[model samples]
Target: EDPVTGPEEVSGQEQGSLTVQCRYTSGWKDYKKYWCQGVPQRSCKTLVETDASEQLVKKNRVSIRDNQRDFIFTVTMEDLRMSDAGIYWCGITKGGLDPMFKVTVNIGPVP
Candidate 1:
């Protein structure tokens, strides 16, 4: 299909939830976990953290959690929309982590 950047693919249906578990390098547990949408290198829009200045909880159904103890972060998107199906990158900001698997979200038909 489209030229793949990342290797991982996940599928969900409209009005469903998508949960992704991403692991970082051992010493990079404290790094921020970003769930970005759009072109991987050109234009990516990341959901701001709850700690962003004057930021309220997101209005979008997007949420991310960091667990330093586990060296893994989980991203959850509820109420999936057709527009939500696309390429994504879920990884750390720095270059310390491994070659992250790029992501493609496919929207499936509702049951």
Candidate 2:
């Protein structure tokens, strides 16, 4: 579960710039997805989070889809950090963990 925050803001403690995306083979409505960051203790390290709950998608340390066919999401944390490394998964609603569509993330040379 996402940690409750002041106005639901992402705690970008030690995050860096990251670009993430999700393209669905099929489309659905009222869907909620996320771009999470994986920490050692934490399972999914959600960076730029997204929610289909309001007039516009609500997210933190992240950006919503760039287009309808696919979601071109980007997160620019600026300063780099080691804890912000993991295979960020792009999980969709309506199903459990196994069927989650994930994207393999790479921690480059702090570019």
> What TM-score would every model get versus the actual structure?
0.74, 0.51
| lDDT against the true structure, each candidate | 0.64, 0.43
Error of 2 at 64 (Å): 2.9
> In candidate 2, how many Å is residue 55 off?
6.4
What does the lDDT read for residue 71 in candidate 1?
A: 57
Q: Sum up the clashes in candidate 2.
A: 9
Off by over 4 Å in 2: 1-16, 39-45, 53-60, 69-78, 95-99
Clashes of 1: 1
Q: Kindly report which residue stretches of model 1 are placed more than 4 angstroms away from their true locations once superposed.
A: 1-7, 40-42, 49-59, 95-100
Residue-wise lDDT of candidate 2 within 10-106, one digit each (tens)?
A: 3233445654444444343346655555543236655444464323343543455424344333334445466555455555545544224444444
RMSD of 1: 6.1
lDDT of model 2 at position 92: 50
